[PDB]
Design a binder for this molecule. Structure first.
Ligand code: HEM
Ligand code: HEM
Ligand SMILES: N=C(Nc1cccc(CO[C@@H](CN)COCc2cccc(/N=C(/N)c3cccs3)c2)c1)c1cccs1
Ligand SMILES: N=C(Nc1cccc(CO[C@@H](CN)COCc2cccc(/N=C(/N)c3cccs3)c2)c1)c1cccs1
Ligand SMILES: C[C@H](O)[C@H](O)[C@H]1CNc2nc(N)[nH]c(=O)c2N1
Ligand SMILES: C[C@H](O)[C@H](O)[C@H]1CNc2nc(N)[nH]c(=O)c2N1
Ligand SMILES: [Zn+2]
Lengths: 407, 411
């Protein structure tokens, strides 16, 4: 019932009680653990509503005040009547913040309470959605001094009228197969890239073509829009000691901004809720650049370094990996765009886990995702026991809208 | 019920039915995953079914299920349990059991090798001096002048819980740790405590940085005894680097034979509390963990100083640069002295083939992703992108408490 988590580097032991609030299921049972698996009515809504407003009013020291009872009353009235309800702005902000706070896979959560929330529930069209988004991009980019933020579109109603951003992130590079049979650009986005072509995006057919946004208001067919290049901050990647590096022609974008998730607050579903912060270096240099099914450049960098690529045991892949990641960080830092290294981020997240154990009674944490994809054991998250569990409010996955939409 | 696991690099999907044979608990529930937690006297009552399951498995492994020999063995085991309260395994069943404990080890990345395990039967052993002798033969067989061979030795099983065979050391070969008055540690910090027990018991400590610990061996519930392994049997490797000549001047070395001595082997309900086993090293175990953990030899600073990296900011990645060089050194040294070792690219690639083959022949392969993925360069090994399923099968290897915490001293 009360659970203990140990850090095996520092012997610090934390006690977790927060998990007893866990409502949703994990995928695991007593027989099988599924921790490495990437994805596992009016009746229903009031319970969810009450659960949320109770924790909101608790959070503001008014649990069991007339204001609380009245809201519980007012929302209850509104559900029985409309079959849904609306959040006050204050509830909205709290709920989005808390959905970040509860994201068990996010290493960046020491920041959870600095989130700018843009309320876009008044939006009706894709052109609206485009406006709101470009404003979010520009706010968040802040000429390189990046700021956390989320833009929230109207909540689901009967599910024939969903708002969706079809892009997986607002800012991502094009992917194209060639007769050749290999891939030009980013292979992760091949299918979406051809979706945009199929809608009429004239494609530069380059390595690093920023994709057009494809936006669906109110359940309609979605529409293309080019984010103004002036709003897309990009970084050329060079190395602080290897002059040839820049001639690999690498660049990446400054703002990571996820746009395909579903935000659940108090029973209500916000199918479009794009959010951004900034990058931990390894996301780019280890994952986007080196993954076999991504830009997959390790071979070519190793060549330029003249390393012995005959044997895996020369650790040439690993040598190249480090230098790439030095280059990503150096470039961002040189250009003054915010970025965090994996050492600093995980040091941060351990400080934060400790805060949340102390103030909240725990912290859901998914070790599989929290531990970076390079140098695992030399970051402190490696030696930290974590408990994973699901709290609401929450971000959740949802199915790619092309597999669901009707034209 | 059928379960699928996908690999996200290759889109290979696998199907799991083997987990239906799982009975032991994970620690997880529908509401909490415990997957990163390091660690989440039997009566006749519980013993016969455990014995029966095991022999049903042993007998289908040899294609004699339902056979007369299968049935007669059940009746013989059963009658022995209820007359003697326990039972003895035949040689063949002990072999098969130890092989399957490895095979069922979901945290082992080297299970490709499962079927090649030399099983020494030390169940005629009565005394500690007997134990030393069996261990020494193990260590010489397994070492094989640097051409390592996997082995396990299996002392008598538990009876009343008061006559246990234990090996007190955590590995058969490990370096001493000495906490100094100034609060620093000389040698290996992980073995400080055990080192302290050994001194108390009588060991004169050379007090250096790489002293091989003596064996501390309990037979038959008796107080344990101190033995020195013959150094001629302890194969060790000086660590040097192929380009950096100053590397050797750091004075590093390490032993070549990894051999776990503190786990409990369970086969058919039986508890074999001393079952040292040995294989060979994945390079990262030494290069990443043993040398560069903060709580172990912690050499990262001194390597990066010699390399004159920019240590003023973490974002130089001066740690990740030092870590790689040290790992290159460890693999280079071992290959140059012709001691078996495997790097983490090659070990993980082999595992992924093992794991697919197993899904095909066996219907599954329990696997602990937190453990299988190496502590450096995670995502550029193929295991990082492999979804795995973790569940527990018997026969199996288990943790047990350190014996100095439970042992009843006689004097
Ligand atoms: C401010 C700096 C931030 C940093 C440095 C950061 C860091 C990360 C990283 C590295 C991941 C793993 C991503 C991957 O491997 O694809 C992650 C996952 C995630 N973060 Fe953040 N984060 C930050 C801000 C945010 C914000 C503002 C939110 C929400 C408002 C958020 C919500 C998430 C969620 C939901 C996931 C997991 C998504 C999934 O399950 O696939 N993070 N975070
Ligand atoms: C032959 C070469 C072998 C290699 C390269 C190998 C590799 C590994 C490695 C790297 C680990 C993780 C160790 C750690 O993080 O401390 C491991 C775990 C393990 N392997 Fe092996 N292994 C080998 C042979 C064996 C043998 C012979 C057995 C037993 C017969 C065995 C049983 C285990 C067990 C029980 C674990 C997990 C222990 C725990 O939970 O603490 N392996 N394997
Ligand atoms: N085939 C896939 N499909 C796939 C199917 C289902 C789920 C996923 C999970 O996608 C994540 C993989 N790393 C990517 O999510 C993007 C993300 C989310 C949150 C934070 C991220 N990075 C940041 N710094 C932030 C973004 C927004 C605020 S901070 C990135 C992927 C692949 C995944 C990885 C390689 S292939
Ligand atoms: N306090 C601890 N003690 C501790 C307490 C309980 C469990 C553990 C886990 O033990 C392993 C830690 N890595 C040590 O196991 C050594 C091992 C086991 C199996 C295979 C290994 N390597 C080989 N290649 C083989 C050994 C024998 C056959 S193959 C090494 C450790 C710590 C953990 C982390 C920091 S301190
Ligand atoms: C199969 C495995 O769970 C999957 O590859 C995970 C592993 N850990 C990860 N961790 C992060 N942070 N991001 C990821 O995309 C993944 N991939
Ligand atoms: C807390 C966490 O589970 C612990 O640090 C684990 C992580 N993964 C590991 N993986 C292996 N192979 N060996 C280990 O000792 C550990 N330590
Ligand atoms: Zn689990």
């Amino acid at each position: 019932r009360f659970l203990k988590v140990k850090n095996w580097e520092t012997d610090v032991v934390l006690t977790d009680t927060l998990h007893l609030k866990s409502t949703l299921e994990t995928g695991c049972t007593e027989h099988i653990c599924m921790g490495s698996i990437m994805l596992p009515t009016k009746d229903q809504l009031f319970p969810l509503a009450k659960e949320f407003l109770d924790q909101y009013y608790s959070s503001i020291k008014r649990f069991g005040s007339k204001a609380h009872m009245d809201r519980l009353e007012e929302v209850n009235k509104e559900i029985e009547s409309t079959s849904t309800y609306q959040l006050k702005d204050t509830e909205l902000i709290y709920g989005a913040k808390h959905a970040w706070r509860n994201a068990s896979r996010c290493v960046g959560r020491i920041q959870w309470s600095k989130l700018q929330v843009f309320d876009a529930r008044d939006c009706t069209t894709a052109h609206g959605m485009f406006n709101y988004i470009c404003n979010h991009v520009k706010y968040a980019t802040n000429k390189g001094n990046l700021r956390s933020a989320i833009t929230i579109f109207p909540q689901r109603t009967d599910g024939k009228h969903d708002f969706r951003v079809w892009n997986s992130q607002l800012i991502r590079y094009a992917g194209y197969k060639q007769p050749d049979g290999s891939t030009l650009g980013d292979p992760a986005n091949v299918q979406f890239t051809e979706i945009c072509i199929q809608q009429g995006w004239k494609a530069p057919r380059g390595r690093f073509d920023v994709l057009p946004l494809l936006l669906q208001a109110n359940g309609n067919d979605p529409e293309l829009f080019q984010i103004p290049p002036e709003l897309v901050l990009e970084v050329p990647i060079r190395h602080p000691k290897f002059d040839w590096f820049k001639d690999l022609g690498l660049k990446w974008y400054g703002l990571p901004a996820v746009s395909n998730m579903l935000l659940e607050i108090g029973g209500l579903e916000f199918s479009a809720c794009p959010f951004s912060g900034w990058y931990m270096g390894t996301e780019i240099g280890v994952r986007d650049y080196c993954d076999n099914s991504r830009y997959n450049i390790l071979e070519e960098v190793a060549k330029k370094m003249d390393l012995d690529m005959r044997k895996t045991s020369s650790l040439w892949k690993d040598q190249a990996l480090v230098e790439i990641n030095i280059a990503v960080l150096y470039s961002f830092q040189s250009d003054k765009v915010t970025i965090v290294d994996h050492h600093s981020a995980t040091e941060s997240f351990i400080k934060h886990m400790e805060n949340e154990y102390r103030c909240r009674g725990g912290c859901p944490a998914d070790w599989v995702w929290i531990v970076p994809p390079m140098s695992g054991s030399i970051t402190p998250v490696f030696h930290q026991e974590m408990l994973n569990y699901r709290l609401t409010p929450s971000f959740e996955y949802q199915p790619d809208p092309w597999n669901t939409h009707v034209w």
